[PDB]
A paper describes a structure:
[name] [name] (VvPrx3) belongs to the 1-Cys class of Prxs, with one conserved catalytic cysteine (Cys48), and has been shown to be involved in pathogenicity in a mouse model. Cys48 is the CP residue that is crucial for the function of the protein. All three crystal structures of VvPrx3 revealed a protomer exhibiting a compact and spherical structure without a C-terminal extension region, similar to the previously reported 1-Cys Prx AhpE from Mycobacterium tuberculosis. All three crystal structures of VvPrx3 [reduced [name] (C48D/C73S), oxidized [name] (C73S) and H2O2-bound [name] (C48D/C73S)] showed a similar dimeric assembly in the crystals characterized by an A-type dimeric interface, similar to that in AhpE from M. tuberculosis.
Numbering used by the authors:
A (entry chain A), B (entry chain B): 1 to 157
Write the structure that this text describes.
Amino acid sequence: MIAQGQTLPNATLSQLTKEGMVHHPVLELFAGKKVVLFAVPGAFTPTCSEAHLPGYIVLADQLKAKGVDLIASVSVNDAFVMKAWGEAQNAEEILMLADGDASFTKALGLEMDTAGFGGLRSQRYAMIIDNGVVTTLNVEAPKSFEVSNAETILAAL
Amino acid sequence: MIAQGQTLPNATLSQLTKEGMVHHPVLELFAGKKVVLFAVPGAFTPTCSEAHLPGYIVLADQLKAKGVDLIASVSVNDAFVMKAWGEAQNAEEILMLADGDASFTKALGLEMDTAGFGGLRSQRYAMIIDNGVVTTLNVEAPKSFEVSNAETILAAL
């Protein structure tokens, strides 16, 4: 998988705007910013709340107070589903990003096969990204109960 | 791995009673009964969407209504910890069983390595055991969001 100190893959993530589909080069979107990015295996799927959208929603103020410019949620889902999920969660403060063909996730080496559930999806992870460089990367290790969360990211700041 | 239709290996499970530590072959405990057995990776381990013991506690009367004689919970833990865990969850109904050296779990082929967390533990699974025969076996598959919860067992009944 990607290492700390490496620049993110020079790839895109998509978002639905009033302009239609926008494909953000992540290295442009995250340039000049301290960014918190977290991934889930799917929009609307269950994850310990502290480790995905609800956790980052309630910690958003504290994260921004410690210098985070942008908090973003990514998943192997399309941009319509990601928009709907943000709306359902009232994810005001969080940028919803779509990796619909799993290309960004595979470039990170953080894909996983869910077989009949949903095909290839993302592992759960969270990053602090400084000007496009991965500074902190925490990846779920479910068999050993490595129970990292938004607080883990807050403390890394 | 043990399979549906097979009879349990007569491996030992332990308990703490007024005699202190005691142990019995599992068929001494389960013969002549319809038993629901729920296994976890560890006592006091958290759940978010996975099956959990309080789910069996809430459905205990409905399980018994459908012919279950005994609801039991097993883990690779010792009997003092299993007793404490049962008390913490107000699980006086449920029989708390200890597989302290993982011999029962290994006999079933349902072990998993948790490495630095807790060494060798059990996968999360549930069984319906009719006079020693595993008539239903549901093993969790977290990557596909398949859970071995009490409702799954209730539907199998």
